[PDB]
Amino acid sequence: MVLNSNELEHIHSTNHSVNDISIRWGVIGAGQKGNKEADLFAGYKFSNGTTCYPTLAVNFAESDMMHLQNIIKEDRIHFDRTPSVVTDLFDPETNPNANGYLDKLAQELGRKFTNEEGEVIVDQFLICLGAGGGVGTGWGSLVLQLIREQFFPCPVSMLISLPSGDPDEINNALVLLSEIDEFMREQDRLFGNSDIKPLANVIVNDNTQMQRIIESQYVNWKEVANDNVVSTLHEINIIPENYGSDNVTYDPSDLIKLLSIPGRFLTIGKARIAKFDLHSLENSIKRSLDEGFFSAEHQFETATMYGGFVLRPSNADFFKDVNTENRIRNTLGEYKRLDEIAGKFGDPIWDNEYAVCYTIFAGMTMPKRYISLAREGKELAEKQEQLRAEA
């Protein structure tokens, strides 16, 4: 059983009835980053020892998989550094024999995500990519195509990492984010507000932002980032199914709507609160949204939907108070006025000593990290253009 956060450790040592999640993810991880994250999801188990997430890892290099932990070799899909090469190999025209590549994929997909009775055991797909790579980013474009060709039995969610500072990795990331933004706009004019979107959301993480948080607190920066990112997603999946409130309960259906309907960019703040004061509460909430693992200068006022919950002790006098539920409403209100959009904010109960406040904004436009990333990007391909002058 994989337990890669204090929150998950507590939960499983206290609750022995963790037998269900809010939304049944099917995790596909592509490229080394993607595989490594998928590998973690694969490790999660219910209280009764069953796997939580059916998980495939996909790659072109078999060296980016031979050292995985929780993914059976059978579930390591292999095909015998430019995003084009991935897409190209899966085109009826561009590659001659791309017929026996689509097929392998579609087969293994049915193998891992369908019943015997040809049903589907998953609610949405969670695809993991370190945008910037060749295998990874390439798979980003590939997925967007497959979604048009209605290849997937249900909606797709993308978990995407943004590169630190390699000018090539930056290019790939930008063309992908660009291609994503362009899918999202098309999706917006093809489907209504109420409608279930084929691309449910995209969750981004900034490597620069993440490395920074990590050095603040031997230790591997990506191993730590991965644990935080993945555990958070798992936690927000676990909690609404396994923890209720006497006041306001964020239940699974609420989360499902939030992850399924907005159809654009999504972000999460996880804030630990032990300091039970209105001030330091406000502060760690703000910290988690602006300088947390999921932050990338998001455009908060473009959010069409919100959600989240503060997980608190059984006698948390504080999280009962009007001003508490008022200060929270106001702190969040600074990012997006809450009376404007759909959502719900819970306050579930748990056996713990501290609390944790989870915050989610969905349906946002392109994060501004795109801009500050590009600025970097252009100002580099010029520097090459010049150094290309010399000789």
Ligand X SMILES: Nc1nc2c(ncn2[C@@H]2O[C@H](COP(=O)(O)OP(=O)(O)O)[C@@H](O)[C@H]2O)c(=O)[nH]1
Structure token digits, residue 35: 């595989």
32 binds Mg ion (CB under 5 A): yes
- Nearer to ligand X by C-beta: 114 or 211? 211
| Residue pair 228/41 in contact by the 8 Å Cβ criterion | no
Q: Annotated binding residues for Mg(2+), as ranges?
A: 64
CA distance to 58, 376, 382, per residue, from 108 (Å): 10, 39, 44
Q: Which two tokens stand for residue 336?
A: 């997006």
| Closest C-alpha to 258, from 303, 212, 311, 295 | 303
Nearer to ligand X, 161 or 260 (CB): 161
d(CA 183, CA 5): 34
- In the bound state with Mg ion, the residue whose beta carbon lies nearer, of 61 and 374, is 61
Q: Which does 226 bind (CB under 5 to 8 A by kind): ligand X, Mg ion, none?
A: ligand X
Smallest separation, CB 94 to ligand X (Å): 20
SS3 at position 141: helix
- Amino acid at site 214: I
Binding residues for GTP: 32-33, 134-136, 207, 222, 226
Give the chain's radius of gyration (CA, Å).
21
How many CB atoms sit inside 10 A of residue 128's CB?
A: 32
36 makes contact, choosing from Mg ion, ligand X, none, with CB < 5 to 8 Å by partner type, with: ligand X
Site string for Mg ion, 49-88 (x = CB under 5 A): ------------x--x------------------------
Q: Binds 207, which of ligand X, Mg ion, none (CB < 5 to 8 A, cut-off by type)? A: ligand X
User: Residue 33's binding partner, choosing from ligand X, Mg ion, none, with beta-carbon cut-off 5 to 8 A by kind?
Assistant: ligand X
Q: Is 264 exposed, middle or buried (0-12, 13-18, 19+ CB in 10 A)?
A: buried
- Helices within the chain (DSSP H only): 6-14, 31-43, 83-88, 99-113, 135-148, 167-190, 207-216, 221-242, 252-260, 278-290, 322-333, 369-390
Give strand pairing partners of 159: 128, 203
Q: Which does 225 bind (CB under 5 to 8 A by kind): ligand X, Mg ion, none?
A: ligand X
**Residue 18 Cβ vs Mg ion, minimum distance, rounded to whole Å:** 34
Whose Cβ is closer to ligand X: residue 22's or residue 207's?
207
What's the closest the beta carbon of residue 81 comes to ligand X, in angstroms? 6
What residue ranges bind ligand X (CB under 6 A)? 31-33, 36, 64, 81, 130, 132-136, 161, 163, 169, 205, 207, 222, 225-226
Indicate which of ligand X, Mg ion, none lies near residue 54 (CB less than 5 to 8 Å, by partner kind).
none
Closer CB to Mg ion, 64 or 169, in the complex: 64
Report how far Cα 378 is from the mean position of its chain's Cα atoms: 28
The nearest distance, CB 59 to Mg ion, in angstroms, is 7
In whole angstroms, the minimum distance from the beta carbon of 175 to ligand X comes to 14
Q: Which is nearer to ligand X, 35 or 201 (CB)?
A: 35
Among residues 226 and 260, whose Cβ is nearest to Mg ion?
A: 226
- E strand intervals along 99-150: 124-130
Q: What is the dihedral of CA 97, 98, 103, 104, to 10 degrees?
A: 90
Task: Give the three-class secondary structure for 349.
Answer: strand
CB 267 within 8 A of CB 296: yes
Smallest distance, Å, CB 1 to Mg ion? 29
What distance in Å separates the CA atoms of residue 230 and residue 49, rounded to the nearest whole number? 19
Nearest to 230 by CA among 367, 23, 34: 34
SS3 state of residue 379: helix
Q: How far is the CB of 39 from ligand X (least distance, A)?
A: 10
Comparing CB distances to ligand X, the nearer of 230 and 258 is 230
Binding-site members are 32-33, 64, 134-136, 207, 222, 226
Q: Which stretch binds Mg ion (CB under 5 A): 18-26, 30-38, 206-214, 290-298?
A: 30-38
Q: Which residue ranges make up the site for Mg ion (CB under 5 A)?
A: 32, 61, 64
